[PDB]
Write a structure and sequence with these properties.
Chain D: It comes from Escherichia coli O157:H7. The structure is cut from a larger assembly and holds 3 copies of chain A, 1 copy of chain B (59 residues), 4 copies of chain D and 2 copies of chain H (227 residues). By secondary structure, chain D is an alpha+beta fold. Chain D is 32% helix and 9% strand. In chain D, helix 5 crosses helix 6 and helix 7 runs antiparallel to helix 8. Classes of the chains: A little secondary structure (155), B mainly alpha (59), D alpha+beta (244), H alpha+beta (227).
Amino acid sequence: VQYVDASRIVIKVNEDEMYPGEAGIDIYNLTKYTRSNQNTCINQMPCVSLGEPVERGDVLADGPSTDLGELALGQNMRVAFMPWNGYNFEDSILVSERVVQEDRFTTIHIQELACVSRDTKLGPEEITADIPNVGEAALSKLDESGIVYIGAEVT
Amino acid sequence: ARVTVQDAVEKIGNRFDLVLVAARRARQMQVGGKDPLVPEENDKTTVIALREIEEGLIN
Amino acid sequence: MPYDENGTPVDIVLNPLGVPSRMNIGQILETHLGMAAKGIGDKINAMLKQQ
Amino acid sequence: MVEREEAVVWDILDEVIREHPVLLNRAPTLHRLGIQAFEPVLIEGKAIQLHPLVCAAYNADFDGDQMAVHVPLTLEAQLEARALMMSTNNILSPANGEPIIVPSQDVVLGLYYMTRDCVNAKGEGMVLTGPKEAERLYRSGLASLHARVKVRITEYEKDANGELVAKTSLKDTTVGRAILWMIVPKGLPYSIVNQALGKKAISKMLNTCYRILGLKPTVIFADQIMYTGFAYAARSGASVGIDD
Amino acid sequence: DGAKEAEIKELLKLGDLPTSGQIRLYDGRTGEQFERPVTVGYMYMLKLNHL
Amino acid sequence: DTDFGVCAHCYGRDLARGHIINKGEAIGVIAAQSIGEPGTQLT
Amino acid sequence: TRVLTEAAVAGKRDELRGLKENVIVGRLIPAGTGYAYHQDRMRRRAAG
Amino acid sequence: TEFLKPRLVDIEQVSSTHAKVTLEPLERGFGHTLGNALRRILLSSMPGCAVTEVEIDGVLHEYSTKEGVQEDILEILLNLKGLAVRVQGKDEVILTLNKSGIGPVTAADITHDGDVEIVKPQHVICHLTDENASISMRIKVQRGRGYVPASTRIHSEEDERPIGRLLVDACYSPVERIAYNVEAARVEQRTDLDKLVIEMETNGTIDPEEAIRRAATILAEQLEAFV
Amino acid sequence: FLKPRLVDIEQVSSTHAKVTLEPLERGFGHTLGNALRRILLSSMPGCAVTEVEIDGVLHEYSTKEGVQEDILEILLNLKGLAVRVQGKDEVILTLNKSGIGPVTAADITHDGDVEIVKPQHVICHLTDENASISMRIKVQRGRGYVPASTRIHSEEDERPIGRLLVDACYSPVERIAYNVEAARVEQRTDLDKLVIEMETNGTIDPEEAIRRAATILAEQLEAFVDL
Amino acid sequence: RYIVNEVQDVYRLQGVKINDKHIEVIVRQMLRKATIVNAGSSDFLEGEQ
């Protein structure tokens, strides 16, 4: 591996398999916390650390529901079988506060909100750049353009 | 302790005329027309008229 | 959490009443080998902290 | 004030809910037994809780039953909820005169483990005069919940014109059945509860308590049962065995 | 033709586990041992996307 | 003998209740649902 | 539209004696809790 | 770090049957650390008094016949096991019961000592039927802690070698039914705390509220070494 | 009731230790056992990094060109960092590093109060040399588990896009069990010894914690002595 | 009485026990109209209430 980052996987390839035509190296840009079909966070994660060669047809990155090239759907831990004060009634499972206290079991749902605009026959639509009858609070979160700064939190 | 109204259906047996009677007494209680006579304990007025059904002074 | 002879808190509690009906037998066998996959880990871990 | 989530209006929230009943309903419901009423309880969360055994009435498991819980605004509907639509009143099916709700299963194995006979019994032979010290024997841990104990159950029977006649009797019962008396209202006799308790036994069991003693005893009795059903279900211990 | 009884038992007894895999746990709210040790272990989960 | 309806007697008492059927209790609709309730069950 | 014709030409005077009817007009049926309600109402109609 | 101070203790009280100590505030796991701890105390160890052993001077058995009482001698033992008695400046006192005559006998015949504190003399023991029947029994009340079943720690009087001491179980804890009831409470904007409602019932000697502070004094004992 | 007292507290490691009390009575080893476990699992002075403002990173869903792991994962390793403090209830550290290498819990600007239990805990790796990362680590001390979700109503106005907030998990303990056995006193019917096993991340001392537990239990004795 | 026997038997294949009161009001419903036989007042064959 030549330059392992989180967003890129630069491989300094061995010459016995490196192309005798314009040398060559392996660059792989990993999907970064993007949106999926089910609006769930998909992110290829760099498993191979810096300072380690690889085999041909081997792996460099994992993805969600997968770990170190192994299909990991959920998580496994200490389970016991006993009807405990109705907390296992009909379908009910009883869980230790530890899971949410660790949040090793949390899903990140990212949402894409398309903004329609651009020229109507009655007014050449711009992306605001100014909001009437309200304060500068609506713009202290936006810029001169009217686009909210990357890194905020809405609700 | 109150949880069932077996007692109430016994007095005004049509189970729906019960609804009629108690409801109206509840509103006289709402409006300061009157006030509760049979001691209440945070009960909304529908429930209080129902106490007057079990005591039997009002039906 | 119900604890064993050692004091390890359990994480999940399920209903035993569904085993005979639903007939989830392979489910419990994987539980024991899963407990065995961690049982051997228990050996390693202790003796590995001892260096 | 609610904009600031001010504690004041949450107390006024207490004034508009603590005795203001609600109606409940599910979408897939096709029957009238699927529309019932209860009293609200302020639970901090996002999901509508319920009394376990009533789910069988709605025929609602835990597979995604989204309920639309309605609010009786008018005086009429509020009383109508607590009247005919009260859970504790429609304890019979309009199809047949049998108790609509039968104790599911978790509850019953708990009491199967209550009234139960096992040959190896710790304290198998002692005597008690009160089901309350029976509590002090198993909930403490010194005795088993199966020991064949001779106890004096001074059971009662409304053989009078409404009065429960006093009749003394001693039974070769098990520890759990003595504790089962702490559950069983006087009016209901110990003879019916000197049985291993099955799903069908406990079915007609609640029905007899109704035809005999009444509805009120039965309602708050089944209530007792629910708590202790799941209670000793935990106290049960024995759950599943590969060796079996 | 997967893991058999004596095969899973060979692994349980290679760690620190008994034949039955029914370990002695005490009540999480009290401390009294659940009569006839409860069957325990590690099960693998699966969370459907129903939130 | 009651036209445009039924008498409490000819009906009875059985329902969720166990008492005399009321004048105002529309048996029509409840009959409908309780015969079609086991509809999902019939095969 | 069938119903239009069906009762329009006959001018069938149905005094709101059915449940379904009572509900589309949003009024208490002469049964249940509207029993004694419409009891006063029925002897107040064409009678008194 | 922040701490809470227990306030608003709405004591729902009824003379002697039960006291229900409503009280706030309890974060997740405190109506537990306390409620179960109390029921543990009330079923296993509560320094009180009770009858340890009773020798029926008449017929030394419990399944045999004593023509005088319609109840059996075994039923007589039941009666004994549950009587709320409480000695004070003594570890053990022996008393006597002497009744003769036709009638349902009350507990007004057992000797009242400066130590012996029979709370309810109206307590009907044995139902004496036809003809006098000179029954006499030596009831042995002792000071104990919790509950001691006469079966492992037995005395060598006339029961281990001879047969005559119809040993009873000493209900040292003057309680009947114990049950903690945790429920969702709220400190206005706060998430759900627990409004611990403790339904506790005592038989007669000790009154509900004093028992709560008596056990509290015993709980004080338990951590005096720290704070 | 004869009072309990601590015998030698078994201090073996920083990770785990065992407090031990000899003079316990009949069943009180079980009694206080579960009782105190609730205490040691809820009201516990723990430390937890809460705010991590970063030099170049705006949102924890980015990757600084130079750092190895994703920023969100690096922050979960910060949740996995065990540190105890002494006076300050709020303190900020500063990670200053540039050069290829695993950054353990030593390279941070270690404050006098700030004290890591195991400085060998690598948090993140660096793959580039000319990668200057400077981040302020705002850690505070409270108790129990407090998520930024429950704290988002106040929010403290986080308009400045550089503020990253992770969960404040003030939980020192990890695995608690208690060892009950026959106390070997030479003159008494029975007593119980209690060797309370406590597993820790390695930040709060056993006896310090038990006196705190007694203090919390002290508040909890107040009301029940005064009905 | 014939049909209530039969259909109830269907409920026997379902094991459900439902009181025929409801099934019989429905039978009454299906017989609420009747073909007149005698003439004189209205018709000689009117399917009427």
